[PDB]
Design an enzyme around this catalytic site. Sequence first.
Site, PDB file in Angstrom:
ATOM      1  CG  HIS A 160      -1.668  -1.260   1.478  1.00 20.80           C
ATOM      2  ND1 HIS A 160      -2.893  -1.523   0.900  1.00 20.80           N
ATOM      3  CD2 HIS A 160      -1.384  -2.335   2.253  1.00 20.80           C
ATOM      4  CE1 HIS A 160      -3.329  -2.702   1.306  1.00 20.80           C
ATOM      5  NE2 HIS A 160      -2.432  -3.214   2.128  1.00 20.80           N
ATOM      6  CB  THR A 178      -4.374   8.091   6.876  1.00 21.56           C
ATOM      7  OG1 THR A 178      -2.999   7.737   6.651  1.00 21.56           O
ATOM      8  CG2 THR A 178      -4.458   9.452   7.616  1.00 21.56           C
ATOM      9  CB  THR A 179      -3.787   2.683   6.218  1.00 21.43           C
ATOM     10  OG1 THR A 179      -2.926   2.385   7.326  1.00 21.43           O
ATOM     11  CG2 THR A 179      -3.074   3.621   5.261  1.00 21.43           C
ATOM     12  CG  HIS A 192       2.257  10.187   7.018  1.00 24.01           C
ATOM     13  ND1 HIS A 192       1.328   9.344   6.456  1.00 24.01           N
ATOM     14  CD2 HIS A 192       1.801  11.463   6.947  1.00 24.01           C
ATOM     15  CE1 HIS A 192       0.334  10.122   6.060  1.00 24.01           C
ATOM     16  NE2 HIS A 192       0.577  11.409   6.336  1.00 24.01           N
ATOM     17  CG  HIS A 220       0.082   8.521   2.167  1.00 21.33           C
ATOM     18  ND1 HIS A 220      -0.701   7.396   2.300  1.00 21.33           N
ATOM     19  CD2 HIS A 220       0.714   8.673   3.359  1.00 21.33           C
ATOM     20  CE1 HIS A 220      -0.518   6.910   3.533  1.00 21.33           C
ATOM     21  NE2 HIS A 220       0.333   7.652   4.217  1.00 21.33           N
TER      22      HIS A 220
END
Length: 257
Positions: free
Chosen positions: A61, A195-196, A116, A93
């Site tokens: 991811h 956030t995931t 991040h 991201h």
Amino acid sequence: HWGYGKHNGPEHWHKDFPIAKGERQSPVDIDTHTAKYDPSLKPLSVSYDQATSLRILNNGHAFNVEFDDSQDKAVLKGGPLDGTYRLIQFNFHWGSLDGQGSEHTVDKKKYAAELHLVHWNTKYGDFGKAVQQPDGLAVLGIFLKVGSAKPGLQKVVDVLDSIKTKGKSADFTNFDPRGLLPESLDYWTYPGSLTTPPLLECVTWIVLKEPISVSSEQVLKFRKLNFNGEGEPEELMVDNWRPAQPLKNRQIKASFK
Ligand SMILES: [Zn+2]
């Protein structure tokens, strides 16, 4: 399994993780005219001089650079934080185009990517316990805009070829994360979540006001990664960002005016 596609994207996450509709979900849009300047916020204290990077990995991811967190080597303190937080990893991201990619937005403006730097509160002993606490994690968010190249990011960019597919990892020692920080440490802060999935609401978000710039060639390399594992049909790893969530009665504080 969850992902960022049409049939398993952010809008579907709530079915397996009901907390997706919680009261303190991330990311959020930072309305600069609504954020409250708080004179009691202390300056951030970043001590990354003893940081020990170990490995870079494509987890399907995004890609993460892991650090040895068995001791107080690289820590974050100060700001709105109480206690010491150890750096465990950094990840990005990004989008398929330069006009999108960041998770957080500023006055609705989307950046090309978002970095991040994840830290966990040491009073909880380990990362696993920390994610179960309201103040277990502190994530430093840094926006990336396309312009001049970021020298400190090149070492990361060059190794991406060796971790093209899901599950691949490579040794990645002696990387200095200080080369990814902007000049100023002014920030916005608010209580939020991962956030995931599992989307745990254990994060104190510290989003830096000043973005860093990377070149078009640099972000192009991110876009060559794959979501899929080796030997499987190629799915480019792009747009691995979750859209802004409702603020829902949380106050975004600013360290500057
Ligand atoms: Zn992230």
